[PDB]
Amino acid sequence: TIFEERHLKYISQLGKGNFGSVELCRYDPLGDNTGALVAVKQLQHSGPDQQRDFQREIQILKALHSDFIVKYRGVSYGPGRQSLRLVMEYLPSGCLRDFLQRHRARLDASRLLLYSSQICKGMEYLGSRRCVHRDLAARNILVESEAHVKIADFGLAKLLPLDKDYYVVREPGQSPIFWYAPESLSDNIFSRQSDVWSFGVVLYELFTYCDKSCSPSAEFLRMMVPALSRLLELLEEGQRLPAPPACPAEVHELMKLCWAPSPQDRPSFSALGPQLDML
């Protein structure tokens, strides 16, 4: 699980987010271009707060073992003990947002429900580890195959101490505001139940095939003082994203429950899973 810097050969960018980037590299210790492709995350530049967070992220992912969480492979170092890069499995079908847009006409509602169930199970597992994800969105889901997706980034994830079932951040966060639960917008509170809110938005993303014209940003902005206050207002009045075109009624009802105003009245991932499998 220790990868030597000198054997990581840089090929291409796979994505970026939250002060980090993921690159496609070949781990090629023979130097003949036959080594395994890996996905390698690093900070885009040096930062002391970001480095502390990055080491924590690595320890979170290292301790996750699930069919629905991207596989941790190891780390590369540089000044010891200074983690330079997080090495993960590379899954070439890539991000679910991109995959849905491209294969839209090939994937039916059963496939979307399968993806929904897999994401829900990943999240049930995450919450069992006292991990709050905080950034659940289709952009952070990875496609292993046409019938298998995995939660694939943990840049903002936090571990809940044993005696507190939420965490409050000091500043407002810097993620697109359209996945945030009301209590995160109003009071920077995050919990496993704000993850459920975000999962409702992920269901919306799936059933819109991440179409840009009716995306959470496009549609909320169209429906919508500062933007965050307008969105909070809109949400506090009980307005919600509209059912996606052709959305099964049962799924739309599940989204609405995920979007209960109060965190306590949202269903658990434990409860959602069986309901998704039933559908």
Q: Is 225 annotated as a binding residue?
A: no
For residue 102 the two structure tokens come to 């491209």
Residue nearest ligand MI1 by beta-carbon distance? 15
Q: Is 113 annotated as a binding residue?
A: no
Cβ nearer to ligand MI1, comparing 37 with 160: 37
33 annotated to a ligand binding site? no
Distance (Å, rounded) from C-alpha 97 to C-alpha 75?
27
Of the residues 135, 153, 195, 211, which is catalytic? Answer: 135
* Residue 20 annotated as binding site: yes
User: For 123-185, where are the E strands, in sequence order?
Assistant: 131-132, 141-145, 148-151, 158-159, 167-168
Name residue, tokens 């690595």: 58
Measured from the CB atom, is 153 or 183 closer to ligand MI1?
153
CB of 109 to ligand MI1, least distance (A): 23
Identify the CA nearest to 69 among candidates 2, 127, 1. Answer: 127
Kindly tell me which of 40 and 120 has the beta carbon lying closer to ligand MI1: 40
Q: What residues line the site for ligand MI1 (CB under 6 A)?
A: 14-17, 20-22, 39, 41, 70, 88-91, 94-95, 140, 142, 152-153
Terminal C-alpha separation, the chain: 40
Please report how close the Cβ of residue 157 comes to ligand MI1 at its closest, in angstroms.
12
Minimum distance between the CB of residue 24 and ligand MI1, rounded to whole angstroms? 7
Which residue from 130, 160, 129, 126 is spatially nearest to 140, judged by alpha carbons? 126
Is 98 designated active site? no
Closest CA to 118 of 191, 72, 67, 62: 67
Q: Which are the catalytic amino acids?
A: 135
Q: Please report, in range form, the residues annotated as the binding site for ATP.
A: 14-22, 41
